[PDB]
Amino acid sequence: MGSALFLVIFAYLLGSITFGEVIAKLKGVDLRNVGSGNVGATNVTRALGKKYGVLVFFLDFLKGFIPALIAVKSFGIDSWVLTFTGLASVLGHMYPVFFGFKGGKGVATALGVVFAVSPSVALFSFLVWLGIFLWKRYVSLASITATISAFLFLFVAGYPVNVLFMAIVIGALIIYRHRENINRLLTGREHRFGTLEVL
Ligand SMILES: CCCCCCC/C=C/CCCCCC(=O)OC[C@@H](O)CO
Ligand SMILES: CCCCCCC/C=C\CCCCCC(=O)OC[C@@H](O)CO
Ligand SMILES: CCCCCCC/C=C\CCCCCC(=O)OC[C@@H](O)CO
Ligand SMILES: CCCCCCC/C=C\CCCCCC(=O)OC[C@@H](O)CO
Ligand SMILES: CCCCCCC/C=C\CCCCCC(=O)OC[C@@H](O)CO
Ligand SMILES: CCCCCCC/C=C\CCCCCC(=O)OC[C@@H](O)CO
Ligand SMILES: CCCCCCC/C=C\CCCCCC(=O)OC[C@@H](O)CO
Ligand SMILES: CCCCCCC/C=C\CCCCCC(=O)OC[C@@H](O)CO
Ligand SMILES: CCCCCCC/C=C\CCCCCC(=O)OC[C@@H](O)CO
Ligand SMILES: CCCCCCC/C=C\CCCCCC(=O)OC[C@@H](O)CO
Ligand SMILES: CCCCCCC/C=C\CCCCCC(=O)OC[C@@H](O)CO
Ligand SMILES: CCCCCCC/C=C\CCCCCC(=O)OC[C@@H](O)CO
Ligand SMILES: CCCCCCC/C=C\CCCCCC(=O)OC[C@@H](O)CO
Ligand SMILES: CCCCCCC/C=C\CCCCCC(=O)OC[C@@H](O)CO
Ligand SMILES: CCCCCCC/C=C\CCCCCC(=O)OC[C@@H](O)CO
Numbered sequence: 308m309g310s311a312l313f314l315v316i317f318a319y320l321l322g323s324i325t326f327g328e329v330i331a332k333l334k335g336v337d338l339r340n341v342g343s344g345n346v347g348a349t350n351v352t353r354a355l356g357k358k359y360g361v362l363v364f365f366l367d368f369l370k371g372f373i374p375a376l377i378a379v380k381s382f383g384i385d386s387w388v389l390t391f392t393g394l395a396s397v398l399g400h401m402y403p404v405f406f407g408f409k410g411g412k413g414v415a416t417a418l419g420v421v422f423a424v425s426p427s428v429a430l431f432s433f434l435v436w437l438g439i440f441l442w443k444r445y446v447s448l449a450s451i452t453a454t455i456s457a458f459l460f461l462f463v464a465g466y467p468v469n470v471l472f473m474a475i476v477i478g479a480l481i482i483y484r485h486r487e488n489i490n491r492l493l494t495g496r497e498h499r500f501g502t503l504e505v506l
Contacts, residue, residue, distance in 0.1 A: 310381070311388045318374035318392045322399020322416055325406040326366035327351045330359055339409070347411035349446050349500070364415050371396040371419025379423055384466075390473040393420040397477050401484060412484040414450045417477050421457055424470060432457040444499035444506070447488030454478045 327346040331338040334355065338346050342353040348367060352360030374396055378389040400416040402408045422429035436453035440446065458474045466474075482489075491497035499506055 311391075314374060314378060314381070314388065315391045315395045318395035319399040320404065321374060322370045322396040323403035323405045323410075324366075324370065325400070325403045325410050326370075327363045327411065328406050329366075330363055331355065334359075345411065346406070346409070348415055353500075367400060367411070367415035368419040368422070370400060371416035372423050373419075375420045375423035384424065385469060387469045389424070390469045393417075393424075393473045394476060396420055397480065401480065412450065413477065413481045414454070417454070417457075417481060420473070420477065421461075424466070425461070425464070428457065428460045428464065431460055440500075444501065445488075445492065445497050446500050447485050447497060448492060451482060451485055451489070454481045 348364035
């Protein structure tokens with residue numbers, strides 16, 4: 308259907324709005340040259356402050372939630388339209404047409420996709436993330452662990468193959484976007500998150 312193609316294209320274009328760069332540019336800051344140089348909510352928190360980072364997280368989450376919600380309600384949980392809508396949102400966040408195809412790691416937007424599929428699974432995956440983050444204070448370790456957990460939760464809950472395909476590809480892409488963090492974690496060179504007073 309034409310409406311299926313338009314929903315997927317809409318999801319990619321919406322995901323291509325790198326809200327970390329939007330907010331930082333509104334503030335005259337080049338997010339690629341402050342902090343870690345990454346463009347997600349974590350680096351916004353690191354460079355501009357937790358309140359700006361919460362805003363960016365919410366906006367990047369909504370990019371994934373809104374199109375996936377439309378897909379679920381219009382085409383059904385079993386539809387491969389949902390599969391490609393969720394993938395398009397995440398791929399837009401990672402490879403944004405509006406920001407030189409240099410985007411983020413995909414965690415916030417992927418959580419938004421999952422929330423449209425299953426708010427409970429999204430909550431459980433967030434709880435894993437927060438637990439792992441508070442355990443060791445590595446953002447990357449929390450995101451990798453929670454991404455794997457999210458797939459396992461959808462699998463054991465019995466979600467259909469279109470959803471599992473969407474989740475395994477999104478999850479693999481997220482882990483790939485963390486490949487440098489994994490290298491640092493394996494060699495003891497990953498930094499814990501926070502100011503010197505917090506740490
Ligand atoms: C840009 C500033 C304004 C805020 C943006 C709007 C945020 C929320 C939008 C509502 C979500 C989209 C509607 C989803 C929905 O219920 O779709 C179900 C529909 O497909 C039933 O067939
Ligand atoms: C790079 C993609 C974005 C720019 C181009 C967007 C539009 C491109 C091609 C038009 C495809 C229209 C397909 C409509 C279609 O098959 O509708 C049939 C359906 O509505 C009922 O069977
Ligand atoms: C990077 C992603 C690119 C996506 C490109 C999507 C467009 C692909 C194929 C176009 C299909 C032709 C549809 C033309 C059309 O409106 O025909 C009407 C006809 O199908 C109804 O009888
Ligand atoms: C169809 C719904 C779309 C919802 C999102 C709407 C788009 C919102 C933000 C993206 C563009 C923000 C650009 C703001 C702006 O002009 O900032 C200028 C300033 O950053 C200096 O370059
Ligand atoms: C299997 C595919 C779906 C994966 C869903 C996403 C991973 C699940 C849970 C983590 C969500 C909480 C993220 C908390 C947070 O502050 O993230 C900041 C963000 O910038 C990290 O890159
Ligand atoms: C449409 C419904 C929206 C539901 C909520 C969407 C936003 C989800 C999560 C935002 C929380 C991210 C921050 C997580 C967090 O507390 O990180 C740990 C750290 O802050 C502890 O110091
Ligand atoms: C204008 C701003 C919001 C843009 C949202 C774009 C959403 C794209 C398409 C809307 C969904 C159309 C669904 C058509 C429909 O009834 O499909 C039913 C489907 O199950 C086939 O029988
Ligand atoms: C619905 C349309 C939304 C459009 C949102 C605005 C996107 C367009 C222009 C904003 C600036 C894009 C370039 C940002 C960028 O990556 O700058 C280059 C970077 O290497 C700076 O270090
Ligand atoms: C699949 C549908 C595609 C529809 C057309 C999308 C492309 C339209 C306009 C491009 C927006 C601004 C792109 C410029 C851009 O990303 O520049 C930033 C880059 O130089 C950062 O190094
Ligand atoms: C539903 C699947 C749609 C596929 C869309 C894929 C995402 C959007 C554009 C593809 C870019 C492919 C090339 C990779 C790329 O962006 O290079 C990385 C960038 O950092 C260098 O400019
Ligand atoms: C489906 C997504 C749901 C996520 C939205 C809810 C986020 C709300 C709260 C998370 C943060 C909890 C408080 C963390 C905190 O106070 O940590 C203190 C800790 O650093 C002490 O060592
Ligand atoms: C397995 C999924 C659940 C999430 C991971 C569970 C790991 C267990 C506990 C995490 C709670 C946060 C505090 C852990 C801890 O020892 O923090 C030390 C810190 O508070 C003081 O240096
Ligand atoms: C805090 C720790 C939480 C850990 C949750 C553990 C979930 C992981 C593995 C359990 C495997 C259960 C057996 C396989 C299973 O349910 O298959 C899924 C599917 O075939 C059911 O439709
Ligand atoms: C069974 C299917 C397996 C599919 C292959 C796994 C894809 C995941 C990660 C890609 C790892 C290699 C990176 C590719 C690469 O150099 O891309 C860089 C840039 O030009 C485009 O992103
Ligand atoms: C949900 C099932 C479990 C998934 C666990 C995924 C863990 C992924 C990558 C971790 C690789 C590094 C292992 C060592 C590590 O984290 O060390 C932390 C610190 O002590 C030194 O960097």
